[PDB]
Amino acid sequence: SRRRHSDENDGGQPHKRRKTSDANETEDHLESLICKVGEKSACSLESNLEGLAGVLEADLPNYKSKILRLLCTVARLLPEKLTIYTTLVGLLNARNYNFGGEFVEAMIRQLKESLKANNYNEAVYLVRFLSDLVNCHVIAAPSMVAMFENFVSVTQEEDVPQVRRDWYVYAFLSSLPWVGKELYEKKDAEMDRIFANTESYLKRRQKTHVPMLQVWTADKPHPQEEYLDCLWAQIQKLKKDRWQERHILRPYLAFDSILCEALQHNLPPFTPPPHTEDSVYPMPRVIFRMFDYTDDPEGPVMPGSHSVERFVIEENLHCIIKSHWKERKTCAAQLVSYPGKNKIPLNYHIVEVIFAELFQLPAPPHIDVMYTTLLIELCKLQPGSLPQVLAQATEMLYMRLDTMNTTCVDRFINWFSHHLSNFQFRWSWEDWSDCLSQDPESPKPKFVREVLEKCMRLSYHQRILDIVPPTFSALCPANPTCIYKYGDESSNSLPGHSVALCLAVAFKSKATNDEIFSILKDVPFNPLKIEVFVQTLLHLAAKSFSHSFSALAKFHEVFKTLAESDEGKLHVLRVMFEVWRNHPQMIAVLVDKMIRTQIVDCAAVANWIFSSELSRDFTRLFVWEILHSTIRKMNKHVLKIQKELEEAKEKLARKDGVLEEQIERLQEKVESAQSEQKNLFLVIFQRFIMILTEHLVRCETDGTSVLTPWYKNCIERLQQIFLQHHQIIQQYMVTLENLLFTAELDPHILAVFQQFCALQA
Amino acid sequence: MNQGTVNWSVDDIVKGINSSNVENQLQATQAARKLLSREKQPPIDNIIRAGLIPKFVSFLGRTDCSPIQFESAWALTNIASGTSEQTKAVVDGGAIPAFISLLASPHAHISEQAVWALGNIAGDGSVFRDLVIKYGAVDPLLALLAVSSLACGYLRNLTWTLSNLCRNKNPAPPIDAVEQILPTLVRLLHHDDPEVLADTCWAISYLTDGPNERIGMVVKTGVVPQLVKLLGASELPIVTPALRAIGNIVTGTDEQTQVVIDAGALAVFPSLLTNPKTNIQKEATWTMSNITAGRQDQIQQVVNHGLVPFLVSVLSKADFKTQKEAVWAVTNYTSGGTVEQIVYLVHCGIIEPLMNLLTAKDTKIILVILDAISNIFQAAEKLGETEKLSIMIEECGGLDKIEALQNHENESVYKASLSLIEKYFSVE
Amino acid sequence: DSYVEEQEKLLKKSCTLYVGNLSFYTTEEQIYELFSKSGDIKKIIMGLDTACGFCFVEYYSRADAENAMRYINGTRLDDRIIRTDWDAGFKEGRQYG
């Protein structure tokens, strides 16, 4: 009846398997091949692209998904290699139509994700990639013309920010140097139409942001143009030139035969993702410009300010730094090996793009110090030609100091002095003699003074006095000695003189807090008590930074007691400054320790910065360095408490009870931290508004000119608060608009708040 | 010099493995792995003879050095992928306890590799299977499969290794191990990957290949309807094992066979009986032959689903190996069937294709057919249609074939054919 | 990034750099000014036997110390090429050489 399977096998499946390949290893190898194509090779680029297209094609059956992944990534992460990868995709497309169609779908997909996650800067690379794929017979030009139509239509939405409209326009005009010719060849009537729309929009845009973002206000020798006005002139010059440009390298031109055989794909209609309350767009920009061909008469002719070559070159070099900024040797190497269709003065472009980055407003793309070490690496790499370009560039930045934005001037000062410290401080000071007979308050003599102060901080007083010509001695910094009020100046009649003597004797034999408190009771909130204590203590620790930190620590209890009140914190700072006014660096490090150990707080320091005692030094760099350092500590404190609260919640997913209570107490400390930060900004703005108003009202009443050196500095320091902390300050719109920067505010001051608003409007 | 780690001599591997510098070791280990995964004639014995296993086993534990765990895991996988002596060497190296430890690695590529190795080791047979289970391989393995979405490779590797813990007999896997494995198999049976499904079916087909207790643990799980659904899958790799499982299940009790009928098996059969893949035809008709050994009400469901004309076609037109199964199906049917059921079978044209196989060179099959004939004559007696059946058999040449069996070499065939001649073909 | 076992763990969370090849005359104040260019300094400890040609620099966050390893390391102060490395952390006694 019933029968088990016979020929008694269990089906004959393999009993064992030997591992003969590895998916990861293959995927890593593919990624390496894709990332490396275009690098130096014994074989030509074209040769390597055909080979690679062959290796990739043969791996499609098993790794297509991966290969697609890799090429999209290269598309958004390596824009400087654009035409290399579009060529590669073009080869794949010619061999495989489905792959191409599939790649294009993957690209539009990724584009939409980037846009939704507010990754607009990457999105532009993706868009440029789609554009160049038209040259590689992968995408039909009319479908590209059509997507750009929807882009420009963004200029049409109602109730959306200028920066949103702006981007879409930018991504479109941006692509034209790559695909301008093709799109205008196939659809010239319709391209003329979009240029009409686009143009009318540019004319309509507001330029409220421009003064906040220019590196120089002066129109000559080079205007610093708003980024879209400039790009539009470049495109318009490209159009007059029949869409011929002389720079971009296009490896696909060598595959004319293969690519003409292939079949194109159409892009689907594209709906720009609608603006939502959560969307964030790039800030507008002003094009940094300092060179023209006359600056390099011996070199190949420099492309003009209004050529698409200048735009592409600079774009690619910024992208090179973005890819390699963490590794300076590699970064320098990539910059110097940047290729092009025709010869260009590469050393001028590199130097110009680096300064474009360091001087960018609101902020450089990367930490300021990187630019210094990068330019040093480039000087070692190109020792025969790059240093002369950098010296020349320096002489040019100097000569144009007069309308340079304060924020940039600070960076120029910090860069130049740090650079010089790497080269024995060698510089031709007499070239800058013009500055010796100008008002000491004007930008040039001010810059020279601040530079020499910085150089002294990287060495020492006598060194600096020794390297400048005798005629610059007036601009040299003071000997950083401390001033002891109760020293050997026969002034026994000063109040607390004898208490100061007791204090000194007690410190020198090693005092305790209780002992110091005891002596201080003999003083007539007690300002005089603070004065004698601080004067004597700082004086006895004057030898070095760590002697001083040591004193602040040892007698921390006395500081915290004497400065419990707000007037106490203020008086400590005031007396500290009377002691160490000749030594700004010591002032900075002491203010830092006092805040970190709560002898004083951020509000006290803000008030102190704007106090009458600091008035003579108010336009000096060290003052603004201290203020910003104080703000940075407030900001970092808030972040730290936020981070701790986020991890307590994340960890919540007796042990429970204890954690919930800790969360509650953390939430309570965040609100307190955030309120302290808001106050600090509020105080800073209130003081700026009050002292700017005093100036403007006095000048207009008295019939004198508003625009003085003092004013240039004060208005731009206010500007500078907004530039460095805009993300934080945007949290305070309602308060600022209602209570500080109101409609009645003198327009000179209001304008700065408006310029700030114009960054994300 | 060598080029990187391609094609080192054993001697180089030995010197690099026996070095103080782990980077030397990591390169030698990789060199061994490349030798072991090469297309042609991996030198397994040479590597074993060079005393490398223990070192390889050490490396599995070098927690700190992620890369060398992987290269060694991959090496030992390829050694154990060979013959019984080669896998026993890996096992004697203490590799089992150490691969299980790796199942918990934070690096997915390493645990995945430990899964593959344990799979090769269990795949050797019942002893190493048991040996693997007893080291506690099961808990962690199943631990990896809780709450997709892992990578494909990874899932397939896990499923394949589980299917080896389910496989082989004498003895069958420990019952308790099976009961803990099964719930995972049930969920894997509902996954979407073709290869995971193929191997989950194999796994189940292994568990159902045993006595009524074993069959009943699979049945009680509720998987049969899903097995029956996979019989219709367009992928042959999945149909085959699903069909084998369903086939093993109906070798069980009538109640267990009822479960597969209840799940829709009979509606797929017409498709499997005419499947151009003859292995499928053969297995399906085998399966049917065990269904028709069931109760009269089950035979009736075979009838009501129109399966008989299909059995007659297979009896007539299929290759011999499939015809043998159909002979069994027909004879079981005639053995348990009611009179009306036999009548219908005769009406479907059973006699001729049945008598045609009396020339078979297979004496066992000849005895089964004569049994069927005897069964059908017993139905004929109750109906008084004995003569009509005789003439039916006579008219298609069936009597000539039964008489020829009088001179058959086999004594049983002679006795059974004589008995038929005597009772029904000797009119006075 | 190329400028950035139990010890391979410590270093990867460290915030302090050991700094060598310094001129014997380079001062704590100068180190403050140079090293602050990558972020805020918690403490500096000068190496002694008088001045010894090395120091420790401890930042408040790792990011700032990574930036010094990338951009201050390998530059030239008082004509000496500055050489920094990750340090497991200062311990008392380690400031003598």
Account of the 3D structure:
The complex is a heterotrimer of chains A (761), B (428) and C (97). Chain A has 761 residues and is mainly α. Chain A has three domains: 1-288, Serine Threonine Protein Phosphatase 5, Tetratricopeptide repeat (Alpha Horseshoe); 289-480, Serine Threonine Protein Phosphatase 5, Tetratricopeptide repeat, CATH 1.25.40.180; 481-761, Serine Threonine Protein Phosphatase 5, Tetratricopeptide repeat. In chain A, 63% of the residues lie in helices and 0% in strands. Chain A contains 33 helices and no strands. Chain A is globular and about 115 Å long. Chain B has 428 residues and is an all-alpha fold. Chain B has 28 helices and no strands. In chain B, helix 11 runs parallel beside helix 13 (194-207). By secondary structure, chain C is of the alpha+beta class. Chain C has a single domain, classed as RRM (RNA recognition motif) domain (Alpha-Beta Plaits), CATH 3.30.70.330. Chain C contains three helices and six strands, in the order H-E-H-E-E-H-E-E-E. In chain C, the strands form two sheets. In chain C, strands 2-3-1-6 form a four-stranded antiparallel β-sheet. A two-stranded antiparallel ribbon of chain C has the order 4-5. The longest helix of chain C is centred in the C-terminal third of the chain and has 10 residues, at 62-71. Chains in contact: A-B, A-C. Chain A binds chain B through residues 1-5, 10-11, 13-24, and chain B through 36-37, 39, 42, 74, 77-78, 80-82, 87, 109, 113, 116, 119-120, 123-125, 153, 160, 164, 167-168, 202, 205-206, 209, 240-241, 244, 247-248, 251, 286, 289-290, 293, 328, 332, 335-336. The PDB classes it as translation, protein transport. The entry lists the keywords Cap binding complex, importin alpha, nuclear transport, mRNA transport, Nucleus, Phosphoprotein, RNA-binding, Host-virus interaction, translation, protein transport. It forms a trimeric assembly. Crystal structure of the CBC-importin alpha complex.
What is CATH's topology name of chain B?
Answer: Leucine-rich Repeat Variant
Secondary structure class of chain B reads: mainly alpha
Major sheet size, sense and barrel closure of chain A: none
* Number of separate helices of chain A: 33
Distance between the termini of chain B: 99 Å
Oligomer: heterotrimer
Q: Strand fraction band of chain B?
A: under 5%
Number of helices of chain B: 28
Q: CATH superfamily assignment of chain B?
A: Leucine-rich Repeat Variant
